[PDB]
Amino acid sequence: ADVQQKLAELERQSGGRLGVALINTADNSQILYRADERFAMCXTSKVMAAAAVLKKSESEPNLLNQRVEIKKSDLVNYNPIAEKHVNGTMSLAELSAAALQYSDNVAMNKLIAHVGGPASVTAFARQLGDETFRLDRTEPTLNTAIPGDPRDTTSPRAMAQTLRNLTLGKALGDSQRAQLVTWMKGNTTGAASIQAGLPASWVVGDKTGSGGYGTTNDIAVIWPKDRAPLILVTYFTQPQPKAESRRDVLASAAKIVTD
Ligand SMILES: [Cl-]
């Protein structure tokens, strides 16, 4: 009850729309806030794309080493790693790491293309038992985050359940699951988001996202000190098309649900 009141107060103060789903694996409980509403995933969808490539690699041993050409025509709006590799190749492993750890949107597009496009990433989610996730578009248009638009959305409940399957469950083989977890633990973009609302000693693997309408998102697997792991999804979006980022709202939500 108190956690629900605190999240409602945070949402009101923020001016936007907040979605939270916590899974506590200690007792198989959930804390949910707007957890069945749809939110634009933005960059948080890169976890599903990387996982689809990892799944494909279970039956193709040379897959992560496969080379992909990077060209000027591949550049999109945010290319921190790929811009350094134009006119050479990157491996699928390198693209997965760049997408997950730097939010590189060329890397995301190469993962999407490799597996067959947005409908193939979506079909992979369905195969896992996630019937909510939809990836409709490529980068950069998947980030428009227009209110009322179901494209490129999921719910907090569904994303938390799927992230639990991918990182702690059996969606991926042991090598592939470990690789995903290692990649997420090495993320460089999340220190102001969920991590900022947790004690410094806790270990986090996370993936952020941002987009239009001030959309500010983070999804995480969390190892609290001497406790069973948690899964936390915090999704946030705002009424104004040009609203600014609000990573502090995600940190505040994380603090509320883990205190
Ligand atoms: Cl505006």
Numbering used by the authors: 28 to 286
What does the paper say about this structure?
To elucidate further the mechanism(s) of inhibition by enmetazobactam and tazobactam, we obtained cocrystals of CTX-M-15 with each of these compounds. Crystals were harvested and cryocooled 72 h (enmetazobactam) or 3 weeks (tazobactam) after initial setup (approximately the length of time it took crystals to grow and within 24 h of their appearance) and diffracted to a resolution of 1.14 Å or 0.91 Å, respectively. Inspection of difference maps in the active site revealed continuous electron density between Ser70 and Lys73, which was modeled as a covalent lysinoalanine cross-link with loss of the Ser70 hydroxyl group. Taken together with these findings, our high-resolution crystallographic data show that prolonged exposure of CTX-M-15 to either of the PAS inhibitors tazobactam and enmetazobactam results in covalent attachment of the Lys73 side chain N to the Ser70 Cβ atom and loss of the Ser70 hydroxyl. More significantly, the newly formed alanine at position 70 resulting from loss of the Ser70 hydroxyl has epimerized, resulting in a d-amino acid with the Cα atom in the R configuration, which at these resolutions is defined clearly by the crystallographic data. The active sites of CTX-M-15:tazobactam and CTX-M-15:enmetazobactam cocrystal structures are very similar, except that in the (ultrahigh-resolution) tazobactam cocrystal structure, Lys73, Ser130, and Asn132 could all be modeled in two conformations. In the minor conformer (occupancy, 0.4), the Ser130 side chain points toward Lys73. Further comparisons with uncomplexed CTX-M-15 show that cross-link formation elicits no significant change to the positioning of Glu166, the proposed general base for deacylation, or of the deacylating water molecule, Wat. In contrast to previous crystallographic investigations of β-lactam-derived BLIs such as tazobactam or clavulanic acid, our study did not identify additional inhibitor-derived products covalently attached to Ser70.
